[PDB]
């Protein structure tokens, strides 16, 4: 059968791509069908639906902000939201823009091959439909593949099995003896709501990490409506700003002012709550300095060891080294270890034996009754989404082949030998991936497609050269941190820009004015 002819494809249905169908769509009436594996919009929002799942980033700036009528209808109810309410608003987009009939749910795209004689790209499904485009846009998210570590004797639990990431809705846990592997953002968030309602917890540490309060609070009516007299305003200033999470972002050297003043402001911040805030909005040179790093990680042990009586206990949960990743917070972590029913072992000491018909033993000779098990470990990268499909440029170049090592890009969103092919928080991109990132691409990309289609143009790449230049520029700002001292989130090359959104909103706006520097047009 011949295939469908369509302007523009879409991949994903998250953020990202709601955003994508709704400016190639509604804004410059081109043909758009979008794909997803999921039987919904939601993205990330649709596959974690653990306990616990919280925004990063406050209320009133985790949404979209192109619309200002969306804005003035806004309500939540804390200053963080959580997994429903966040489903719910996307669908509430999705229905509001008239998106959802766009889209094919429950289908994967399998492989993705130029046509150069055409200048079009045949883009097939897991279930059978084959499409041709003259766009293609990747909103592919982070997602990768699931983490299972393989323990001896693991199919011998008569128990449950659940991981984070396929978390059956509805589950009651309430009386169970638990046990979690994993410390990460989402074991913390797991642990945290399930130890009040469970029998018993026993949590697998493997390597502890430093974690700030969140501060999720209470917000009135009134609070609400004075965020949105001065929408346009806040707004101005989170897309100027590095990290945009809705705080000033310090320049102060942390070691210039006395031992007292740097308590305070640390204090100051804890209090508030706020990952980004703590390594951000009290000094500037957190991750630049080591005086100042280690002054803010021996500030945060300082608190855990306050907060959690057991000394045995706070020892096995202390954090070492930089304090340098993606700033972690929580809601009460910590004080869960203070609960009779919560049991911390230490795997790094005490490691697990095997696991047996309903527990883990571990090597000391301890069995732990166990109901169900929860697995919050982790994924893969940001290119695991992008090398598990058949994507073929000029001369039939495989991404794998293309990015034989590491993945690379020109501003993030486009790469060579692939033309008319554009990616939504890909490779070199920012590390600061939240919504209004998440705009700035979407609408570079709607941008770009317009500027094609008005001046008569069937192909746009980026030089090899461009994006050599991007990739010197990535690693040059990436080698003023301490990050990439050891090995941070990194491939033995960088993986983001990290100059923050401001600096990176006014590359691509230079990049349009000076006539699309980087890329080669082939016109007629
Ligand atoms: C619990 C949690 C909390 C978070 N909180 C924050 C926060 O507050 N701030 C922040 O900045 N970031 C946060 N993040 C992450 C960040 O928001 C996401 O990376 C971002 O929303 C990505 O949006 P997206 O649309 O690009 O991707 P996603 O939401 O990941 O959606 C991508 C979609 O593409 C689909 N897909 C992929 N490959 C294919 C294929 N081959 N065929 C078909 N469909 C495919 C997937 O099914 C998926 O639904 C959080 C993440 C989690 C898990
Ligand atoms: N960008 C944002 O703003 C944002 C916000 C929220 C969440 N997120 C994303 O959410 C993810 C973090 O959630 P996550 O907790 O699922 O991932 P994670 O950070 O990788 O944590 C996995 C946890 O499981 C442990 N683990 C893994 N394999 C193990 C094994 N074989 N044996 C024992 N323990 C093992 C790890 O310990 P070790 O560390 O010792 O290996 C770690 O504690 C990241 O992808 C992050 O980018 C991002």
Not at 4 to 22: L, M, N, P, S, W
Not at 277 to 303: H, L, P, Q, V
Not at 341 to 362: H, Y
């Amino acid at each position: 059968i011949s295939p469908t002819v369509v302007d523009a494809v879409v991949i994903g249905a998250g953020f990202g791509g709601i955003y994508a169908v709704h400016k190639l769509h509604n804004e410059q009436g081109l043909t758009v069908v979008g794909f997803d594996k999921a039987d919904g919009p939601g993205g990330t929002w649709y596959w974690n639906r653990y306990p616990g799942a919280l925004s990063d980033t406050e209320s009133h700036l985790y949404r979209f902000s192109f619309d200002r009528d969306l804005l003035q209808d806004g309500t939540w109810k804390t200053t963080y939201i959580t997994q429903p309410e966040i489903l719910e608003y996307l669908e509430s987009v999705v229905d509001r823009f008239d998106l959802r009939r766009h889209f094919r749910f429950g289908t994967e795209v399998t492989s993705a091959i130029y046509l150069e004689d055409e200048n079009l790209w045949e883009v097939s499904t897991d279930k059978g439909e084959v499409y041709r485009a003259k766009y293609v846009v990747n909103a592919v998210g982070l997602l990768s593949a699931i983490n299972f570590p393989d323990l001896p004797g693991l199919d011998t639990f008569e128990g449950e099995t659940i991981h984070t990431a396929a978390w059956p809705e509805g589950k009651n846990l309430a009386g169970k003896r638990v046990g979690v592997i994993g410390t990460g953002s989402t074991g913390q968030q797991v642990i945290t709501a399930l130890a009040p309602e469970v029998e018993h917890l026993t949590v697998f540490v493997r390597t502890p990490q430093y974690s700030v309060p969140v501060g999720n609070r209470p917000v009135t009516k009134e609070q609400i409506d004075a965020i949105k007299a001065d929408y346009d305003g806040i707004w101005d200033s989170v897309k100027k700003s590095a990290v945009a999470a809705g705080f000033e972002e310090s320049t102060l050297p942390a070691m210039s002012v006395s031992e007292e003043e740097r308590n305070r402001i640390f204090q100051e911040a804890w209090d508030h709550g706020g990952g980004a805030r703590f390594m951000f909005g009290t000094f500037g040179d957190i991750a630049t300095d080591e005086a100042a790093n280690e002054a803010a990680a021996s500030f945060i042990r300082s608190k855990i060891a306050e907060i959690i009586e057991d000394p045995e206990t706070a020892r096995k949960l202390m954090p070492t080294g930089l304090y340098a990743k993606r700033p972690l917070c929580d809601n009460g972590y910590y004080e869960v270890y203070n609960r009779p029913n919560v049991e911390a072992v230490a795997i790094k000491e005490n490691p697990i034996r095997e696991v047996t018909a309903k527990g883990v033993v571990t090597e000391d000779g301890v069995l732990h009754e166990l109901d169900v098990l929860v697995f919050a470990t982790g994924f893969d990268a940001v290119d695991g989404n992008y090398r598990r499909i058949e994507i073929r440029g000029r001369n039939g170049l495989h991404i794998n082949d293309h990015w034989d090592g590491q993945p690379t890009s020109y501003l993030g969103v486009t790469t060579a030998n692939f033309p008319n092919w554009f990616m939504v928080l890909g490779p070199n991109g920012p590390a600061t991936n939240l919504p209004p990132s998440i705009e700035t691409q979407v609408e570079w990309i709607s941008d770009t497609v317009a500027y094609a289609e008005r001046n008569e143009i069937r192909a746009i790449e980026p030089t090899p050269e461009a994006e050599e230049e991007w990739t010197q520029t990535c690693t040059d700002i990436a080698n003023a941190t301490l990050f990439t001292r050891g090995d941070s989130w990194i491939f033995p090359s960088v993986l983001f820009y990290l100059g923050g959104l401001g600096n990176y909103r006014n590359v691509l706006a230079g990049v349009v004015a000076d006539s699309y520097r980087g890329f080669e047009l082939k016109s007629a």
